[PDB]
């Protein structure tokens, strides 16, 4: 369960955002990608897999997964194959005028989302490190 | 200290790679960026800052840090401003033929680097930051 991520897509301004949610914690990684293709999805996954110990990704199983490229990255990386899209969009719309480019607003929104403290509440960022640390030791 | 990262640049095939190293662990985040500019550097930092609890980034203080945009992102994110290229390049050259694009090889190399094991860098950074949370 600390290894399980959910990958979805979401759309704003005519652009594609991939959102990876670490299910146990609610931590997110998200980025604008230029197109919802196997190759860009596989790149985004390979990046995620290098940064966190990703055991299983649950995806929407759509078009960008029926090909070779995501499967190749997942095999290589040893990965087995929302309210969150809505929340992220909400945060993006609060910071959107601060940045010219959507991608910057996305990463501000990821920062906000992951560091927000919902109380001695923990943020998503603290939750994910604590869940994985606990799993390691 | 758990919040301290070092940001360097490295070059391969005419492309720019930014490498952020979490100094206490050796964990890296690296990406190819289109150009060594303030804007692309500030984007890379803003991304890093949303994923890890980055308190200080040590950079090389060069041209992409003299303008506005890195400082605006570090201000926003609350980051203070102030071996590894070689190892990553080594890994990159071992996987390079597996990928058409340099960026893919870079992320394979980051994956190798961070997961290679008796802890890996990826385990070290989470254990260091989890220990910090209290």
């Amino acid at each position: 369960s600390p290894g399980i991520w959910q990958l979805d897509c979401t759309h704003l301004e005519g652009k594609v955002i991939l959102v990876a949610v670490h299910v146990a914690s609610g931590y997110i990684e998200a980025e604008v990608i230029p197109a919802e293709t196997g190759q860009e999805t596989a790149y985004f996954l390979l990046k995620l897999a290098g940064r966190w110990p990703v055991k299983t990704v649950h995806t929407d199983n759509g078009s960008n997964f029926t090909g070779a490229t995501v499967r190749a990255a997942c095999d290589w990386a040893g990965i087995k194959q929302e309210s969150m899209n809505k929340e992220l969009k909400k945060i993006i719309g609060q910071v959107r005028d601060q940045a010219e480019h959507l991608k910057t607003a996305v990463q501000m929104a990821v920062f906000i989302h992951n560091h927000k403290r919902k109380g001695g509440g923990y943020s998503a960022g603290e939750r994910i490190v604590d869940i994985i640390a606990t799993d390691i030791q | 200290s758990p919040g301290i990262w070092q940001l360097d640049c490295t070059h391969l095939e005419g492309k720019v790679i930014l490498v952020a190293v979490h100094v206490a662990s050796g964990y890296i985040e690296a990406e190819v960026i289109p150009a060594e500019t303030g804007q692309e550097t500030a984007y890379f930092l803003l991304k890093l800052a949303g994923r890890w609890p980055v308190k200080t980034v040590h950079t090389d203080n060069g041209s992409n840090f003299t303008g506005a945009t890195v400082r605006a992102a570090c201000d926003w994110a609350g980051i203070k401003q102030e071996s590894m290229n070689k190892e990553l390049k080594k890994i990159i050259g071992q996987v390079r033929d597996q990928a058409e694009h340099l960026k893919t090889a870079v992320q394979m190399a980051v994956f190798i680097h961070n997961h290679k094991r008796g802890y890996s860098a990826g385990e070290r950074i989470v254990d260091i930051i989890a220990t910090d949370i209290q």
């Binding site: 596989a42 490229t69 190749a72 990255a73 | 597996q98 990928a99 058409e100 694009h101 893919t104």
Partner: peptide, 6 residues
């Protein structure tokens, strides 16, 4: 024929 392409 590569991981990301062909």
């Amino acid at each position: 024929p590569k991981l990301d392409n062909x």
